[PDB]
Ligand binder design. Structure first.
Ligand SMILES: CCCCCCCCCCCCCC(=O)O
Length: 148
């Protein structure tokens, strides 16, 4: 992944996000509801120290579970450690593209709407990468727990 966000201001990614689209290098990372990188971002909470707390949902044991993880800052503002989280691109107010790296990337949006522009930038960021599965969700699914 050789696309990072230059001048990323991590405080400005705070708040609500929707996992509009997901993509992975291997089908088994996203194919099942219980697939390991099938994670639905809920909210980003950057810390004063510039770490990133992530609230998300994950289908485990036949149900939609509320989850919390801290991604720690690095010397690079656009790269965090959990496994690396890279921020590819964001305009803060509509969309944010990220990857975790075996590789999974998402298109996050601020609202439960299909943002064609953001999905274009997403597919273009992926053009390069060796993705073998891509999912996207409709507005109804975006307002349900675990996008059911
Ligand atoms: C721009 C920041 C968005 C990054 C969101 C990272 C998503 C968190 C990945 C969670 C790892 C899965 C853990 C698990 O449930 O086993």
């Amino acid at each position: 992944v050789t696309q990072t966000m230059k001048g990323l201001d991590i405080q400005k990614v705070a708040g609500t996000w929707y996992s509009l689209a997901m993509a992975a290098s291997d089908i088994s990372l996203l194919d099942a509801q219980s697939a390991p990188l099938r994670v639905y971002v809920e909210e980003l909470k950057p810390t004063p120290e510039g770490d990133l707390e992530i609230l998300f949902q994950k289908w485990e044991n036949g149900e939609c579970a509320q989850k919390k993880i801290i991604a720690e800052k690095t010397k690079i503002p656009a790269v965090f450690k959990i496994n690396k989280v890279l921020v590819l691109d964001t305009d803060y107010k509509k969309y944010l593209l990220f990857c975790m790296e075996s590789l999974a990337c998402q298109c996050l949006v601020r609202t439960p709407e299909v943002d064609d522009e953001a999905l274009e930038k997403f597919d273009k960021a992926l053009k390069a990468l060796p993705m073998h599965i891509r999912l996207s969700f409709n507005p109804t699914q975006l307002e349900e727990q675990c996008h059911i």
